[PDB]
Amino acid sequence: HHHYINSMSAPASVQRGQAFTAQLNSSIYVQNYDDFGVVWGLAPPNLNTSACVGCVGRRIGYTNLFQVPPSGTVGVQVTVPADQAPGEYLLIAGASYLVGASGVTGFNYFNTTVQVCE
Amino acid sequence: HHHYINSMSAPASVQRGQAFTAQLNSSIYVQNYDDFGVVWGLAPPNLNTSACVGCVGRRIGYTNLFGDKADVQVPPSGTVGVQVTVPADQAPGEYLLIAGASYLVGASGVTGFNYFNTTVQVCE
Ligand SMILES: *[C@@H]1O[C@H](CO)[C@@H](O)[C@H](O)[C@H]1NC(C)=O
Ligand SMILES: *[C@@H]1O[C@H](CO)[C@@H](O)[C@H](O)[C@H]1NC(C)=O
Ligand SMILES: *[C@@H]1O[C@H](CO)[C@@H](O)[C@H](O)[C@H]1NC(C)=O
Ligand SMILES: *[C@@H]1O[C@H](CO)[C@@H](O)[C@H](O)[C@H]1NC(C)=O
């Protein structure tokens, strides 16, 4: 229990209804750290997280994690629903976690721009 | 898809090293609502959450709630029991049992944690 997800990547373009792979990177940490899961969201590219605290957009997946390489890469399956309108979006990964002796829990967010094609 | 965990209960006393049954209630929700999982923590009885934002204390369990491989099936409205086990080395005494339920809600996809606590005595 001493590694955390530190970043997320994904293809620049995806086809709706067709699964693709998102990559999650991890690194070692001194404090105890638990990655519980990752919610996958598809958001408008203009999303304002200050006005919409915690927002990830439309939920398109959830990955339970609680396997994961402590200091490397893991691939995760993600699908944009077939009915999604084409265009530019933000793909948002919301990683739930616990850290430390006090058990601080929360979400870390990672995003990338993706083009959703028919 | 339209229900949410709104409360938690547990026994007044639990034996360390032994699993006990905690209860999670759920209610109907107007907007779309996902419960992803519940982290179970043992926190000092004096925990100030204003100073320790989002703290659950020592992690003693995690219940995955999403998908068909979910640990338990939450009824849209009602209660479900969850097996939670206090570590065998836990110091005896009074604690807060804290349940941290991760969620997503609404068309904007607001994600976060809801916290429910109850006082529990841990005995040898
Ligand atoms: C993830 O980590 C690997 C090295 O472990 C690196 O090659 C890759 O570029 C990283 N991706 C991101 C988005 O940081
Ligand atoms: C997307 O991530 C960047 C950092 O990688 C951050 O500055 C930006 O606020 C994020 N956007 C949203 C909508 O979360
Ligand atoms: C909801 O939980 C409370 C205790 O937290 C309990 O009194 C009640 O019976 C529960 N709901 C149902 C349907 O029993
Ligand atoms: C315990 O739950 C009550 C709700 O009845 C809440 O007011 C209180 O802040 C909780 N305690 C902590 C330490 O969060």
From Swiss-Prot, chain A:
Cellular localization per UniProt: Secreted; Host cytoplasm
One Gene Ontology CC term in the entry: host cell cytoplasm
Superkingdom: Eukaryota
Main localization (coarse): secreted
Summary of the function given for this chain in its UniProt record: Secreted effector that induces necrotic lesions in Nicotiana benthamiana. Interacts with the rice receptor-like kinases (RLKs) BAK1/SERK3 and BKK1/SERK4, inhibits their kinase activity and suppresses INF1-induced pathogen-associated molecular pattern (PAMP)-triggered immunity (PTI) in N.benthamiana. Also interacts with the rice receptor-like cytoplasmic kinase (RLCK) BIK1 and inhibits its kinase activity, thereby inhibiting PAMP-induced ROS generation. In PTI, phosphorylation relaying by RLKs and RLCKs is critical for the initiation of downstream signaling.
InterPro entries for the chain: Nis1
Name recorded for this polypeptide: Necrosis-inducing secreted protein 1
Region of interest (BAK1/SERK3-binding), residue spans: 88-117
Domain commentary: The C-terminal region from residues 107 to 136 is important for BAK1/SERK3-binding and the host cell death suppression.
Family: Belongs to the NIS1 effector family.
Gene disruption: observed consequences: Severely compromised the virulence of M.oryzae on rice and barley.
Sites where a glycan is attached: N25, N48, N111
Keywords of this entry: Glycoprotein, Host cytoplasm, Secreted, Signal, Virulence
Subunit organization: Interacts with the host pattern recognition receptor (PRR)-associated kinases BAK1/SERK3, BKK1/SERK4 and BIK1.
Organism annotation: Pyricularia oryzae (strain 70-15 / ATCC MYA-4617 / FGSC 8958)
